[PDB]
Symmetry: D2
Subunit: 327 residues, 4 copies
């Protein structure tokens, strides 16, 4: 199968599996797993933050993030199109008792400053004390503009709130824009980075932040069930992914460009200008028969096509010709 459904489907490489073979493990509950400790220390330093926490998913990474910034009743301003609001079953509100404050989100993950400013609650009993603003980079494969970020920071400083980044595909934004992680992450108090997407690690994510923030997140990790034992196997794989699989993301972007240009040339509607990273969003002028046709020819997606490690140049051409055949 040529799988263009998501970049999560990425499988561990032989070099990754060999690193997992020789991965020294310990009990993480006692803080005695050398693999997880090395990953957390590396991740924290890589992003220029104090501490880091290793969790089984990006959902937990975000869930614990919003909960460590917001006590019960406290507010978290985020986009209605953001993964934390719509694709995480509103975990932070249901489980953590936090007040989720959705706000319109643009094609890039930018939330209008006037929308966020009006969402910040005045000190009054009818309202919820807003404490945090959430952002997402990348958002639908789009790169969050850096000058905008610096303005949201000044907005957040004006009200003394906090800033969390859902950076599930942060490194895609890094390699596409030409700005480094340290620069993309500096305006944020905390960031979630997914290892189990483009980077190609089998399981996991990192939550990075200040010593106090992480300490509260770690305590909640135990409560939600994220406290594992010998997770050094998974941690090393993530550590491998973070230092060996970053630069080759340019290929995913390259192949996504090639796929986008090959399909835009055809009864198809897609904006080539929206193709910034490893995602191609397209339309027909419908959908069910297209998917059945493509599945029968060993090709998989769901108007969204996502390139990754397992996808090659010949896969790109095979899918382009399948669309061309569909005519």
């Amino acid at each position: 199968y040529i799988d263009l459904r998501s970049d999560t489907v990425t499988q561990p490489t032989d070099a990754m599996r060999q690193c997992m073979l020789h991965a020294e493990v310990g009990d993480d509950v006692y803080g005695e797993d050398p693999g997880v400790n090395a990953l957390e220390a590396y991740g924290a330093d890589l992003l220029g933050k104090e501490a880091a926490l290793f969790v089984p998913s990006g959902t937990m990474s975000n869930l614990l993030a919003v909960m460590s910034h917001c006590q019960r009743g406290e507010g978290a301003v985020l986009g209605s199109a953001a993964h934390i609001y719509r694709y995480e079953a509103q975990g932070s509100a249901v489980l953590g008792s936090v007040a989720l404050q959705p706000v319109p989100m643009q094609a890039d993950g930018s939330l209008a400053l006037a929308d966020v400013r009006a969402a910040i609650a005045p000190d009054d009993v009818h309202f919820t004390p807003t404490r945090l603003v959430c952002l997402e980079n990348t958002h639908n494969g789009k790169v969050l503009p850096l000058p905008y970020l610096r303005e949201m920071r000044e907005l957040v400083d004006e009200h003394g709130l906090q800033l969390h980044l859902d950076g599930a595909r942060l490194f895609n934004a890094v390699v596409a824009s030409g700005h480094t992680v340290r620069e993309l992450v500096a305006p944020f108090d905390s960031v979630s980075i997914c290892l189990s997407k483009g980077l190609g690690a089998p399981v996991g994510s990192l939550l990075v932040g200040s010593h106090a923030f992480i300490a509260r997140a770690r305590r909640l990790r135990k409560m939600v069930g994220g406290g594992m034992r010998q997770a050094g196997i998974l941690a090393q794989a993530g550590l491998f992914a973070l230092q060996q699989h970053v630069v080759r993301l340019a290929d995913d972007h390259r192949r996504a460009r090639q796929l986008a240009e090959g399909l835009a040339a055809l009864g198809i509607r897609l904006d080539l200008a929206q193709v910034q990273t490893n995602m191609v969003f397209l339309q027909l002028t419908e959908s069910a028969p297209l998917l059945a046709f493509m599945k029968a020819r060993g090709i998989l997606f769901s108007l969204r096509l996502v390139t990754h490690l397992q996808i090659h140049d010949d896969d790109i051409e095979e899918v382009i010709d399948a669309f061309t055949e569909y005519l």
Copy 2:
């Protein structure tokens, strides 16, 4: 003071105090308060619903309403400008583990496309279970044709419909439709007694037997289980029987207030004044501080009620005329 801040400032009349004086009481926890039992029975009959529940406030009425429709993680669709969403500390979510799903609110109506795009069956999504509307949203009446279409939408997916009817009776007299005609499309209705109707304390959550049985259980948990609430309930009853028709006066006072202020550096639309609210713009802090000194109180918004008279409407008109 001429108090146009809100209709919640309404004071009990001497006739209402009289009914509160001779109110027969019992222990509501045992279900033995005759004043409470009568209000709830009358409330359920008035709206053509199976059962009703007396509560300390409209916040609790709504708190109990959505929690009784939605269990842990289940979703409720409401307006971003709805009182349940922005003026109730998201209690439904914080205390009740309910997923609040705000959609744009225009008029007070929610676009049918916006509601059904918000309705969700998969692991990433919250299962939607309820839709919330607010009749008399900022003094504006919800159209009955819109209610007719909303019911059919929630019937498709087997969802429930709740009415935040804090000022339902303002809508009833102004639109010229019967109470039952406005509440028929709703499974549950929450009506306030402590606003225009003039009762000192409380609200009524109305719905099915089982729904109210759930709300009643939750009322004890949040701490709304009162004892001899008959004195409050009889007041609410007195209001519901004798203070509904005269709301037509509050509308007229607002109408005379709007037309009287529109004739001046004043920005206000007269098509917004449908009931007892007057929304206004200056073409703000020194404005009300000046009015403070003239014994006139408000906060862009001016609301009429029983304690507001014709001479009070003329005085506030005059004060603005001297101000500009």
Copy 3:
């Protein structure tokens, strides 16, 4: 009907109803109700505390109390048989996300050893913030020397101390110690006005300024923010000024009921205030006879007279 189910059945006296007729009211949401302000000012001052907050029930008062002490995941240690844990549907846990830590109950006291062992710094545990005590508990009086011990325990571990004084004044009149004395070791106190005191509705939560301010905020979220509650509040103020010393009669009448039945299984040492617990269908016989209670438990109050007490003894001796 002679109603000995609870002191919650107490009705307003004509004097109280009169004070309600003339009660001055405003909007409590803006803090403009002079009736609720006056009761809050009086209640705070009476117990020697910075502030007070008026709520529609004893359940709300306790709910807000623990939620103001303990945030999500924080612990509150209390008695197994305590009202906050046993009879309030675990609202503070379900709605408030606090960890309730029930400890065995001895007079209604908690063994200091049990409370010490209940205090959690580790990720498997919930960080304790509060201990809860109840006075009176099932009518018995909580010993004053034990209170000072608890405060010393609380000061050692940096915790807070809450009193469920739903029947605090029953303890005050029976023990011979002042309100200030029984309340001084507590950071916060709930007082019910709708029991022995005879007010129709509501309780009062008292504590520090910052505490009440947190409770006032949570009051709005739970739906306890009323409008013209001064009529209810003045009724409570009346009860708190007029109905305290006469509780000694309820105690006396409970004492005389207990002696009339203990002669006829009943422990006379447990009859300390206005409650009588006994043992041996019977309820069906009494209901027809014109007498109501629950079970096991008979509770005297404002509306119960000497003739009532004598009549229920006669109904018991016949059965």
Copy 4:
């Protein structure tokens, strides 16, 4: 180090690592990972249940189970000494809004107390929905006759029954009774893989189709929804068919350690020593410091035997003899 702190310190064996190297994977969200699918189908079939769910820890397994049985305001009666109540930061209550109802806890919960704990139909109380047992509890085996009596009680009240079987396989090999025999009276069972069995990560929640479906939905909400988890799942599958029978050696070595330690100044009864745990009293802090210096680790004092504890390790006796 000789690590007798817990059986959680168990390291993967070379064979287990080899099994993890050639383990086939897929995306678990799409249900396409053959490793976890094989583990879950095998786990469900091993215990005679309909379905199973793979999770990052025993804590999450228990957390989702209580939440899948109990909704908001619903009660679950468990042991005060039980892990779900004592050592899981009351996650079920804090996050899941369920009423934890601890009861005095061989690990059994006295029927009379469980009966007294079940709440009657009233607004003051939380409708009880679940009772939780634990086997093994502190190395002690739950008596099978008592289990059949507990099932009688839960059928009587129409409740669910969950097992925290973190060390269930210790019970099966020590009692002679098979897994299905110990698990049959339970609606849901939670087995750990990262303890005695020696897998690096995870547990299985097993139950009915509908139950596990609900647990799967909640798993996503709490963050247990992994991607390529087949590598962990295969190691769990390996341990489940390769490391069960050898748990007898863990019991044998625990027996020998207890026999050798129960020396003057040491107090312990061997009647409690039934599986892989040894609880022992000195007639404490200075002992830990001394043992650590001699390369022995443990945490009244509990000692736990497991996979990488050898016969000549059970040296610990000599150290105990030298110290006292």
